[PDB]
Symmetry: C3
Subunit: 241 residues, 3 copies
């Protein structure tokens, strides 16, 4: 079972039924019967007479399903057309459900919640990556590395066969021009040479920087790339600890 969307598509239908209500009172009956068809039993509601404006579902996304609770994020619009009065709302919307013999139903009244922000904060300053150290390495080694990297970065943006000469398992990139090496700290690791590198590429008319960790093996007068990452680790200059 690599994929199973049956539940999700079901609840998507529920959510549409619930947040959809047209203006014409005729057609407004059928809509509610469509909605009631989702429940095992229409929920027992003591309240006398709910008020209910016409509504359109603008956007729905299932964020999680945990136990017998599905949680959506919803954006819907409430309209009275006479001239038009409108409001747009977003909310969380939580649906209690269950399964009978591979079939689904809504089991209960849904409930509203706030959409939670996903972004983390409160970061230790110890977790920041500053690219400010300098290595105490030869200018001659720096020249050799620098000369290798222009070839590498040329190949990495242009030719797969050439890249395979100087690097293991590295795919080339599309639609890109190499421009500049802007940073390079070198660290000997027994027989390997780690290069931590930031460089500059142009895609269309726009340039971006990216970071690399190269693991270099000596071959001929030059290098071979045994391993390439796309992040510089925080502990990159730990030849100093």
């Amino acid at each position: 079972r690599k994929y199973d969307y049956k539940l999700q598509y079901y609840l998507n239908d529920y959510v549409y039924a619930y947040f959809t209500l047209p203006q014409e009172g005729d057609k407004q009956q059928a809509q509610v019967e469509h909605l009631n068809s989702f429940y095992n039993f229409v929920p027992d509601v003591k309240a006398q007479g709910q008020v209910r404006n016409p509504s359109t579902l603008l956007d729905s996304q299932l964020v999680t399903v945990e136990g017998k609770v599905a949680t959506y994020k919803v954006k819907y619009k409430e309209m009275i057309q006479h001239d038009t009065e409108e409001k747009e709302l977003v909310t969380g919307f939580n649906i209690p459900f269950d399964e009978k013999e591979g079939k689904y139903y809504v089991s209960g009244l849904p409930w509203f919640s706030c959409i939670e922000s996903s972004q983390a904060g409160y970061f230790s300053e110890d977790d920041q990556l500053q690219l400010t150290a300098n290595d105490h390495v030869s200018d001659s080694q720096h020249k050799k590395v620098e000369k290798f990297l222009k070839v590498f970065f040329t190949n990495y943006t242009t030719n797969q066969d050439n890249l395979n000469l100087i690097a293991k398992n590295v795919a080339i990139v599309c639609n890109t021009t190499f421009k500049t090496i802007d940073y390079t700290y070198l660290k000997k690791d027994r027989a390997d040479l780690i290069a931590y590198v930031q460089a500059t590429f142009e895609v269309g008319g726009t340039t971006h920087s990216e970071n690399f960790t190269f693991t270099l093996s000596e071959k001929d007068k030059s290098y071979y790339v045994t391993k390439l990452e796309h992040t510089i680790p925080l502990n990159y200059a730990n030849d100093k600890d």
Copy 2:
């Protein structure tokens, strides 16, 4: 591997190539070669002169993948050309695709086949499974009042202020864009030191009012209650 859509996007492409055929006879050639590129080898079909009208794919969704079989739900329209006019007939069906993988790459291995779209809605329910909110509890009139007085504060806070809510309840987030309106129902049940309230109440969001259900687990604190646990369902077997 938290997420992997590679297969799904692939099959999405297959399904579009299969249910798409334009009118322009020049463009209609290339479309078939595009389709044939999905298979390892174009499937062997004995029947000659298949009848293939133009069609447009209106909608496709992968519903499951099991083994080397993908199952879609499809809505497409065929453009059937008469003499006097043209017909546009709209069909939905299920559509099952046999596939395989070579070294993290994909291909369609076989002729796909059509099926009925499964209804996902359950039915034929025992009446024993319904939630009937009718009873009056065996529980004191005075407790009824104290709970009722607590719940207006709770519900006020639950819709208005996080700090206040934390005084009277553990780990309960407030709700957005909501006004409290009414408590409409309340059955109380003694559980040793705790008091379970089953509660239905009425909120206004925008210009619309909805009912919702709660199970509170209430602990005595001061002259009042503390909310140890809050659920958003009343359980079927809630009474005595």
Copy 3:
């Protein structure tokens, strides 16, 4: 936990912030601050200055998440006004991320890649499925099978109760007329008789072929379908 899209929706927001830059050189500042809010710390960039044209995100899809690396496929347009030049580009776009207490952040500069083709090739010709063999099986069995399969295929397109008489656990199909059996190779396997079959169905005004493997058990004067597959195996004429 059947479903959890929290990460995916997060990275969708990142990708929109990154590939979006409006023309107004002032509302262009707030956009960058919106983008910077994703990272734990705004990445340290040694290169000075940098050229950034307005851009609109046309399309994004997360293809994989592996470790702390998300990989997208992206389609965006760059808008250069001087009249208007628009470049439309697709690329891969890889985002390094992490989680603190069920929350997310982008941890580093993202990087571009080629969108990998998903289609396999380089197939052995031994793996092609040709329906071209003829069985060395009696002409009388051929007739009995043929007569069964018209009933089966009629039922399979028309009536569930009838289908259950002649087959275990086979759902009928909707909106379909049976038309023709176009191929049939028969093979005894111990007690069962395997039929490999291709037939022709009409849905709307269009006809398609499909393939079946039936496992047939003798019942009465006829067959019972113990197992139905929808693919003929490569090694069928064994």
